[PDB]
Write an enzyme that holds these catalytic residues in place. Structure first.
Site, PDB file in Angstrom:
ATOM      1  N   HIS B  43       3.590  10.244   2.014  1.00 27.53           N
ATOM      2  CA  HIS B  43       2.773  10.460   0.817  1.00 27.53           C
ATOM      3  C   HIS B  43       3.310  11.577  -0.069  1.00 27.53           C
ATOM      4  O   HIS B  43       2.850  11.711  -1.212  1.00 27.53           O
ATOM      5  CB  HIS B  43       1.294  10.717   1.178  1.00 27.53           C
ATOM      6  CG  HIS B  43       0.998  12.117   1.620  1.00 27.53           C
ATOM      7  ND1 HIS B  43       0.886  12.473   2.945  1.00 27.53           N
ATOM      8  CD2 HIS B  43       0.789  13.252   0.907  1.00 27.53           C
ATOM      9  CE1 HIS B  43       0.636  13.769   3.031  1.00 27.53           C
ATOM     10  NE2 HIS B  43       0.571  14.266   1.809  1.00 27.53           N
ATOM     11  N   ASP B  99       2.504   7.719   8.219  1.00 21.86           N
ATOM     12  CA  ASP B  99       2.803   8.615   7.095  1.00 21.86           C
ATOM     13  C   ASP B  99       4.064   9.410   7.419  1.00 21.86           C
ATOM     14  O   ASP B  99       4.023  10.578   7.827  1.00 21.86           O
ATOM     15  CB  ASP B  99       1.609   9.536   6.860  1.00 21.86           C
ATOM     16  CG  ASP B  99       1.708  10.320   5.558  1.00 21.86           C
ATOM     17  OD1 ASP B  99       2.619  10.042   4.754  1.00 21.86           O
ATOM     18  OD2 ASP B  99       0.856  11.207   5.341  1.00 21.86           O
ATOM     19  N   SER B 198       1.376  19.317   2.971  1.00 21.77           N
ATOM     20  CA  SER B 198       1.822  17.960   3.253  1.00 21.77           C
ATOM     21  C   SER B 198       3.271  17.936   3.678  1.00 21.77           C
ATOM     22  O   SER B 198       4.129  18.506   3.008  1.00 21.77           O
ATOM     23  CB  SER B 198       1.699  17.115   1.980  1.00 21.77           C
ATOM     24  OG  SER B 198       0.361  16.888   1.635  1.00 21.77           O
TER      25      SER B 198
HETATM   26  N1  LIG Z   1      -8.279  14.388   1.181  1.00 21.75           N
HETATM   27  C1  LIG Z   1      -7.430  13.209   1.404  1.00 21.75           C
HETATM   28  C2  LIG Z   1      -8.098  12.285   2.423  1.00 21.75           C
HETATM   29  C3  LIG Z   1      -7.423  10.946   2.572  1.00 21.75           C
HETATM   30  C4  LIG Z   1      -6.965  10.514   3.809  1.00 21.75           C
HETATM   31  C5  LIG Z   1      -6.348   9.283   3.944  1.00 21.75           C
HETATM   32  C6  LIG Z   1      -6.184   8.464   2.846  1.00 21.75           C
HETATM   33  C7  LIG Z   1      -6.641   8.877   1.612  1.00 21.75           C
HETATM   34  C8  LIG Z   1      -7.257  10.109   1.475  1.00 21.75           C
HETATM   35  C9  LIG Z   1      -6.045  13.670   1.835  1.00 21.75           C
HETATM   36  O1  LIG Z   1      -5.927  14.423   2.788  1.00 21.75           O
HETATM   37  N2  LIG Z   1      -4.972  13.237   1.151  1.00 21.75           N
HETATM   38  C10 LIG Z   1      -4.897  12.347  -0.019  1.00 21.75           C
HETATM   39  C11 LIG Z   1      -3.466  11.867   0.014  1.00 21.75           C
HETATM   40  C12 LIG Z   1      -2.692  13.052   0.576  1.00 21.75           C
HETATM   41  C13 LIG Z   1      -3.647  13.700   1.586  1.00 21.75           C
HETATM   42  C14 LIG Z   1      -3.532  15.222   1.553  1.00 21.75           C
HETATM   43  O2  LIG Z   1      -4.008  15.877   0.621  1.00 21.75           O
HETATM   44  N3  LIG Z   1      -2.880  15.775   2.574  1.00 21.75           N
HETATM   45  C15 LIG Z   1      -2.563  17.198   2.637  1.00 21.75           C
HETATM   46  C16 LIG Z   1      -3.165  17.872   3.864  1.00 21.75           C
HETATM   47  C17 LIG Z   1      -4.619  18.193   3.721  1.00 21.75           C
HETATM   48  C18 LIG Z   1      -5.442  17.996   2.657  1.00 21.75           C
HETATM   49  N4  LIG Z   1      -6.674  18.470   3.018  1.00 21.75           N
HETATM   50  C19 LIG Z   1      -6.564  18.937   4.267  1.00 21.75           C
HETATM   51  N5  LIG Z   1      -5.337  18.790   4.742  1.00 21.75           N
END
Ligand SMILES: N[C@H](Cc1ccccc1)C(=O)N1CCC[C@H]1C(=O)NCCc1c[nH]cn1
Ligand SMILES: *[C@@H]1O[C@H](CO)[C@@H](O)[C@H](O)[C@H]1NC(C)=O
Ligand code: NA
Ligand code: NA
Lengths: 11, 251, 28
Positions: B43, B99, B198
């Site tokens: 991602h 991922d 990330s």
């Molecule tokens: N809040 C979303 C939840 C989600 C999970 C699965 C599919 C879609 C969305 C989410 O986590 N994402 C969105 C895409 C990238 C990801 C992200 O930011 N990861 C960084 C680590 C993090 C963020 N926060 C706490 N550790």
């Protein structure tokens, strides 16, 4: 926010 | 990283910063697994809901860093990308299943006191260490709070959580290609990865051979450091056959 | 590689970082 990096890496 | 601390110099010499060329900004973390290969979250490179789809020429990799924003002359090394490989079954539509992505560098990086690769786990090390309660270490330059940014690389140690507890903490579908980590509300201690972390590594130091292994990749979470929520990590060993296939055929 | 996971400024010099013992103590 970031310090400029050397131009050689952006070419 | 929320509720972590400043890293020591050379504490995470496999830490990689993914850097956008224009505008010049941090994109993600990543890890060095050999002199030519970097591991990250898919991602970080491809996420259509946010209009994210980077190509090789969009990006740089910065290795050996400690300061977030400084150009660390004579210490860090900046590398261009030859090729990106994203897992073919990466599920960006639903839950970030699988991922994981690899980046091949145009030229090998020279190792130093500040630049050195992490190990990838074998089946036995994974079975022995990926147990509830066992702690790993997460590192990154991401946000210090959910709702600012650190001067230097941050580090936090977090326990792996039992799978039923992970599943019961969220409405998102969890898969065998994920694990979760973090403290429970009743445990007192805190800490989490956050946006900007990330793709960074979740590492464990094997007590058998005293080497650091990358067991996870920072993948997702609902908020950052929220009580009753956990951070979710890509299960590196479960996807190692794909890693090995890519490196064997494109190395 | 053969030298993976051994940090120049820590394992290679037999120096410990300030929190790795917390990890070891959890490996129970
Ligand atoms: N809040 C979303 C939840 C989600 C999970 C699965 C599919 C879609 C969305 C989410 O986590 N994402 C969105 C895409 C990238 C990801 C992200 O930011 N990861 C960084 C680590 C993090 C963020 N926060 C706490 N550790
Ligand atoms: C991502 O971009 C590449 C080239 O820019 C394109 O071939 C591919 O279809 C894109 N993927 C998605 C999911 O949009
Ligand atoms: Na659930
Ligand atoms: Na939490």
């Amino acid at each position: 926010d970031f310090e400029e990096i050397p131009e050689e890496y952006l070419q | 990283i929320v509720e972590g601390s400043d890293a020591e110099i050379g504490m995470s010499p496999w830490q990689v910063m993914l850097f956008r060329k224009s505008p010049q900004e941090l994109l993600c973390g990543a890890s060095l697994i050999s002199d030519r290969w970097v591991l990250t979250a898919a991602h970080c490179l491809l996420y259509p809901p946010w209009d994210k789809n980077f190509t090789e020429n969009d990006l740089l990799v910065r290795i050996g860093k400690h300061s977030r924003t400084r150009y660390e002359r004579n210490i860090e090394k900046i590398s261009m990308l030859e090729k990106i490989y994203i897992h073919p079954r990466y599920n960006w539509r639903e839950n970030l299943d699988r991922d994981i992505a690899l980046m091949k560098l145009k030229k090998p990086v020279a190792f130093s006191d500040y630049i050195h690769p992490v190990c990838l786990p074998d089946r036995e090390t994974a079975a022995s260490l990926l147990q509830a309660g066992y702690k790993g270490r997460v590192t990154g330059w991401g946000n210090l709070k959910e709702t600012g940014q650190p001067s230097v690389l941050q580090v936090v140690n977090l326990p792996i959580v039992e799978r039923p507890v992970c599943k019961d903490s969220t409405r998102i579908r969890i898969t065998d290609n994920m694990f979760c980590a973090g403290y429970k509300p009743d445990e007192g201690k805190r800490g989490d990865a956050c946006e900007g972390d990330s793709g960074g590594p979740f590492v464990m130091k094997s007590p058998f051979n005293n080497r650091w292994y990358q067991m996870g990749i920072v993948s997702w979470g609902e908020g950052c450091d929220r009580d009753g929520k956990y951070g979710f990590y890509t299960h590196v060993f479960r996807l190692k056959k794909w890693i090995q296939k890519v490196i064997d055929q494109f190395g | 590689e053969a030298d993976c996971g051994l940090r120049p400024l820590f394992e290679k010099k037999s120096l410990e970082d300030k929190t790795e013992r917390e990890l070891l103590e959890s490996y129970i």
